[PDB]
């Protein structure tokens, strides 16, 4: 899997 | 009442399977595998619902996480769409601008954010206040 | 969503970064994502000298361009400018692809080069043109100049190169599915002597086209029909099915030469068995197709696999669908000689765990019994043990055999209903509630109980099989004529329901006809309802004489699989 | 759920009164 | 901050293989097994961390065959976060036997009963999260007592309110109604609204049957909206989520009022109807948020509010003005807001005081059946055409659904078929229409023509003397189509059976001509279809004794007389005796006109109603 | 294993 | 003909999908995943009509490969196409699974369009696809005329430093035999898998014991099949690289390399006592290897106990069957296994429904009695011959379905 | 695979020609 982050903006 | 709420990253790993129902392991994989199929095709110009056997799904995709609620047929639509968004926006405070990578490192921590906002098949607690309080107070002292 | 990220990527000034954009557009197309939007941005990449890209712009073009006819014009000048390229592999790709775009303006700009290409120096192009004509015919089926591409097509058959004439024949049979008045055409002594002769040099696939073609043809004299089969026989091998069966399909049609008539006919019946068997050795899918084809071929000509029967003994780790066919075939092959080992295998079979196997396998004894008198006494033995095991779904299936056995060996096995009614436990399978009711029917004089039995089933009428309904109607007016004293209150009900409730027009008509007979003349009523019915025939649950002959003329096809004429698979 | 078996066939003559039939037909008239 | 976890789980997100997780997890199933059995004992972190690796592996799909009772230890614990991982491991796994089922539920009994707002939040929740029979039976009489408003703290009456619905749903028998009723409606008048949202639910699903009893606090639903909207701008900061004043809770109330009719108190219909025109006037002020979360929840209510408005059906002010309201969501840009304005406009269409208006929104829907395109968005638009259809609408509304039918998705068709069937017959000025449309229904579907639809095209035709002769001709003419559908033959076979004589005249449909053509389908049909034809044959052997020649020679045929199928023979034999042994007066009296079908329930509507759920 | 031939 | 062509993973997710006819839409690709891969009831066939759309398929590793069509197509021709396709793939990117699918996803599409035009199988032949699909004018004009010719097996000329070739007479021995020891069915189905490293357009001719007498034998495309139906010459210009030149079936005089001998005797109600015995059956110099002996168990199987006098067994509930492995076993030997099984009476009282004893095994002879009498070579232009051609012949016999009722 | 006009062959049996024979 890869790097995932942020459910905003 | 709700049949279940799922989450699934675009890639189709199960990152929250809640069962208020006497489903079988062959009929749990199938609907997890299935829900994904119906949901990970639909853009922003289709209805965020859709029938699903003798029930229906409510869902929204927040960049790269597929939140779904298989609800009853007569259970309110735009009212269960928010129940995700206002369930999201409590994850938003508790994990501090939440992602996917938290929902795994903290995989035993959104069950408590769940059981709080929903239980048995129906909603239970819908203040971003009394929620975030019963969480962090349950934590800070053990 | 993440769809602009792409439009972006598809413009980036490094051509390799654009490429790897499309690659992601293809992937997204594959898994549903309606990238319908990006059309023009893909089309800006199609005027490129790098093929491995051009190719993937086409895979895209093909899909969306029917639902984008407006914009899809963007593409046309690039296409026509490929159908002229000095590289034939580029030409074939251009034309191959442009044929697949379905919007009438593009259809028109297409006719220009698809004329060129049907006449192209290169055969790999002509191979393509030939195909591109069936594609065309699937829209603008008229196109008058394209009534004059049927011209171009036909003539490709003569063409030197075998891959052209394979796609010629292939294309041209499918075009020939519009047959209002003056169609098929073809089919002459010049033609066939090319085809059959090319039936060697054409590929694997070309072979299945030509054979599936000829099977259409009728010959006249026997001198001819033989001299054909001598050139089809050699198809004994490879597409370890397709070609073989398609040659069986022909060879089976070309068998009007009367039973013994010739040394040939009693040799072509000899040739047909070995390569038929061999299909069972192939992979489990073709095993199936060829098991389903045997099961037809057994009925037309039971002379071919007459002996061979050992070849159908089901094995525990055969794939269920191969077993189910192997069983039903052995039963057709069951003879005065080999009910011995058949009955033996049948009882191996009925201890399996697949329920619809075990069943078909016991049903298979009754079918056997009914077919081979000598067995009946011993065949009926087998059903005791099986019943005595007390496995409900076996009993339920046996009652269904036991009934039809009575009807062929008219009760000299009464004893068994006592036995099997004390192994029953429950009777939930309607297939088999029917057979209980009808036995209690026929023999209501010999069942002191019968009026209980048939009362029991009136409790739940609507919500029983419109078979357990029709079968009970008759089983209670049968009882009534037989014990009218003590019954009337049942035909009161039954006939009531069948007349005054049922939404089923046809069970209402049956519920009148009885009510009318009884009411108008009871002497006729009895002599109609209880009239002596002949014995059922030893057959092996068969197929209708011409419905067969139609299928036999469909032996490679999906028809031979489903055992149902085309008209249960829709027009396009 | 009850269940039963079958006697053997008779050979000759103890017959069935048509009057029994006609009587029992006469009586029956049908329901909703 | 467990490192046993954050090490082990950091290995699996660093992985780049599916059979490499089969290494790293099956090392961690061979790791934890060494822990409990053999070597010393470690508690606190060691029974907490070497279990949280077994709840995390069972959400990656691998076998928890070695490890459970390790965690049936954490249940009767001291801390809050040493039980939590035990009541999320008898919530995701009720054990493999009935072994621990008596050891689980006395490490629950001691925790419910221990007066505690923390250790009742784990112990009543688990009964509402599992909903087992053992977990139900023994804690039946218990739950009524807790809930009674009084002594047990606020956010525990939640955990009982929604454990007595779970249990009343799993085990309704072990929940009959005592007098904890009157104190539970008392909860509606609460300060803690998390309890009211948990109790407004429980008052519904139980007293779904009878709110007449619970009615009282019915009215006082209003008070917690109208005084947080009509006057001030951005009201009490409690739940002011995207400017909508506490939404996911006024849906639960308007949805308890939808159980049994409008309120009888003339003041409580004067307070409710005032409040209804607060929500019809929250949606007569424009978007004070551009992002979609607002209109959602403003309408999440406004819909459930409309959902009641209809259910009342009593206020033709709030009916024909709420349908003009849903007739401004049809053309709206969102597909959700159009979709729901077809889900709900649906319901109105059949209420006298609303229909005439609804009916006059039609073309919008037709030309939205002929638009959006995503099965579901158009699908729901049929359901509306189908509801709005009366004698006016029909001919258009039929030919329209007929159009949809072809193109439309295999997975229903019948759905549409059943509808067209029902409509056609229910609104036919001329019945020569009814026949033509049911025949279309057989050309276009046929494979989806149902059972009961082709029953009813006969029932009706042997009730109408004007059509008989027409049916006969039209049906006849359908059957010389060389590739006709089975269900044509099942119909056309019974139709000429009764009315073939009204076409005998025509020289291209003489009784020889007719019979010969039915027998052209006989060999190509299902037993049952053949069984019918045999009746149509022996009927013909009365209508026309011209052909009693041929029809007998068919019935005698080995094929028919010796058939393996019971009826197919039962009949062939019977029919032959009649043909031979039965007077002429007796045969003609017996094969009479066949009586008209009595007016009745129409079992088509009964099957559409059985397609749902 | 493989054995040479003619 | 062939309408669509769809590959999926174990999860019902799409990997490649190429539609060749308007006949067919998303509708279908969806209506398989639903009706076949997520289907509740599993008892089925490889062909499947749904709403007058037909749905052929195959599985490999964890993969589904479906053909779709709205026609009365040549059913065989499809499955055989499905197979030749799967060969093409594995023989381009090794192993047919989700990784190697997604990794060559272009190479696939690129191939799917070349191998299939408008649903008509074109040129499935890997030995030609590799002249112009990559993992001058007279230079294309060849690469085409070759593709469309009569040969499509052989790139022209391209040749080896020494002319060489290998022949694997692989065989698989099928048996059904009652618990007495009576051969009900038994046949050998074998195949002769060349490996032509010859040079040019080498003509060839192949003999064996064509009179052991063969019950029937089917060829590859490369054998001149009318020359075979006049004389009995197996004449063929062969593919380069490995390729399957003929399959044959043999029913009579069969070296059945193992007699299972089962002996069960339940000791009352609860104790079950099972004794299987092997008897190897060939030259004792030779040794059979990779010997498995699946001994199936009751369904009321409490007990897991075994003592084996050779090899190494290991009971498997879920399998509900003992699996007993012998490293090697020489010809004309014996060997036992023993077991003691505990019966907790599950349902009412069905007398347990005993499968047979199935056996996998390799042995290094041709159980058919088939032997390769010769293999002629000839290239008239470039002059080499036998007496500068290497040759080779192996002989391997697996099981197949080696069932023995118990 | 190619290298310089000739084709290659995967193996570690190694070359074995006539093997103690003649051309007599």
Numbering used by the authors:
A (entry chain CCC): 235 to 243
B (entry chain SSS): 1 to 142
C (entry chain BBB): 13 to 584
D (entry chain GGG): 357 to 388
E (entry chain AAA): 9 to 621
F (entry chain PPP): 1 to 6
G (entry chain MMM): 1 to 135, 144 to 219, 252 to 446
H (entry chain DDD): 318 to 341
From the paper:
Proper operation of the pivotal CME cargo adaptor AP2 requires membrane-localized Fer/Cip4 homology domain-only proteins (FCHO). The AP2 complex, composed of α, β2, μ2, and σ2 subunits, is pivotal to mammalian CCV formation, and its deletion is embryonically lethal in mice. FCHO1 and FCHO2 are similar in overall domain arrangement —folded N-terminal acidic phospholipid-binding homodimerization F-BAR domains and C-terminal folded μ-homology domains (μHD) separated by a ~300-residue, low-complexity intrinsically disordered protein linker, which has been suggested to participate in AP2 activation, although how it does so is undetermined. We dissect the network of interactions between the FCHO interdomain linker and AP2, which concentrates, orients, tethers, and partially destabilizes closed AP2 at the plasma membrane.
Since FCHO destabilizes the closed conformation of AP2, TGN38 YxxΦ cargo peptide (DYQRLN) was added in the hope of stabilizing an open form of AP2 in complex with FCHO2 linker. The resulting crystals diffracted to a resolution of ~3.3 Å in space group P21. The structure was solved by MR using the bowl of the open AP2 and Cμ2 as sequential search models and demonstrated that AP2 was in the open conformation. With the assistance of anomalous diffraction collected from crystals in which the FCHO2 linker was selenomethionine-labeled, we were able to fully assign all of the N3 FCHO2 linker block, confirming our earlier identification of the N3 binding site on closed AP2. The N1 and N3 blocks of any given linker bind to different AP2 molecules. N1 binds to the N terminus of Cμ2, and N3 binds to the C terminus of β2 from a different AP2. The weaker electron density following N1, which “points” at the start of an N3 attached to the β2 subunit of an adjacent AP2 molecule in the crystal, is the start of N2. Hence, the FCHO linkers appear to cross-link adjacent AP2s and thus provide a major crystal lattice packing interaction. These data both confirm the locations of the N1 and N3 binding sites and suggest that if N1 and N3 are simultaneously bound as anchor points, then the closed conformer becomes destabilized. However, since our earlier data also show that binding of AP2 to membrane fully opens the AP2 and simultaneously outcompetes off the FCHO linker, i.e., FCHO and hence membrane binding cannot be cotemporal, this solution structure cannot be physiologically relevant.
